[PDB]
Amino acid sequence: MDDQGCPRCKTTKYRNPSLKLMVNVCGHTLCESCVDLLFVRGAGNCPECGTPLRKSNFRVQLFEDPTVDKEVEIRKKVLKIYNKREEDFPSLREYNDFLEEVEEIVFNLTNNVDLDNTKKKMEIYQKENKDVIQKNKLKLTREQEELEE
């Protein structure tokens, strides 16, 4: 809430900081009062960029850094892949190789074309979906619940 104001309507922030950033595929700061301005005309179009949005492409985020918003949001989807625990990796070198590869994919998606990344993800899907992906999904809730308690 320390930002000077919205690029277009920098008046609501000065009055109150209750407004929060809205994340979009544009990786593009937006504010609730300004969101209504987008709905009236275009209905899911960035004001200056004009990037189309399927249904408003809006979710609540509170990180003033635009690039990080995409990185964090992209990372959530990436976590769904290559989520196997370290114990599944016997070799010492491969422990972080997947993590290094996983982090590499994140950077490619943020800036590089995702066509190659999407194609690669399909290759892993055909193999990992059978056992490793399903196993960790079920176990995610178990570990999370125990850790919270």
Partner 1 sequence: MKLNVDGLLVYFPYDYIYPEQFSYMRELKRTLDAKGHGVLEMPSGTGKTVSLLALIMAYQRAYPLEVTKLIYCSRTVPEIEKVIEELRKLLNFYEKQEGEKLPFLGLALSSRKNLCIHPEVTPLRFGKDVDGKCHSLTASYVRAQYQHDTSLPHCRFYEEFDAHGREVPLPAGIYNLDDLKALGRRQGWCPYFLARYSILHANVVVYSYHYLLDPKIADLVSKELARKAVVVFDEAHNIDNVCIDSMSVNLTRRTLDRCQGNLETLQKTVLRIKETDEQRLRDEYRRLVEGANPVLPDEVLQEAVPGSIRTAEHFLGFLRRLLEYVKWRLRVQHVVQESPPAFLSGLAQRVCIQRKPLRFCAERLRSLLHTLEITDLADFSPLTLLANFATLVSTYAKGFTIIIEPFDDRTPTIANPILHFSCMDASLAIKPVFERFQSVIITSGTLSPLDIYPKILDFHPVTMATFTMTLARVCLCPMIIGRGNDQVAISSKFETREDIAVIRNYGNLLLEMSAVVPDGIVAFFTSYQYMESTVASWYEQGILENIQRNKLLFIETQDGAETSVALEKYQEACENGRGAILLSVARGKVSEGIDFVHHYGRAVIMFGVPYVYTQSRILKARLEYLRDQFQIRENDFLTFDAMRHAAQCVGRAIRGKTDYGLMVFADKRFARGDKRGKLPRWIQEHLTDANLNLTVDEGVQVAKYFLRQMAQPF
Residues that bind Zn ion (CB under 5 A): 6, 8-9, 26, 28, 31, 34, 46, 49
Is 15 or 93 the residue whose CB approaches partner 1 more closely? 93
Stretch 1-30 residues interacting with partner 1 (CB under 8 A): 1-2
Nearer to partner 1, 34 or 78 (CB): 78
Query: Cα dihedral sign for 68, 73, 76, 81?
Result: negative
Position 75 contacts partner 1 (CB under 8 A): yes
Instruction: For partner 1, give the closer residue by CB, 17 or 52.
Output: 17
Residue with tokens 């490793």: 132
**Nearest to 67, CA basis, from 24, 10, 101:** 24
User: With contact defined as beta carbons under 8 Å apart, do 54 and 30 qualify?
Assistant: no
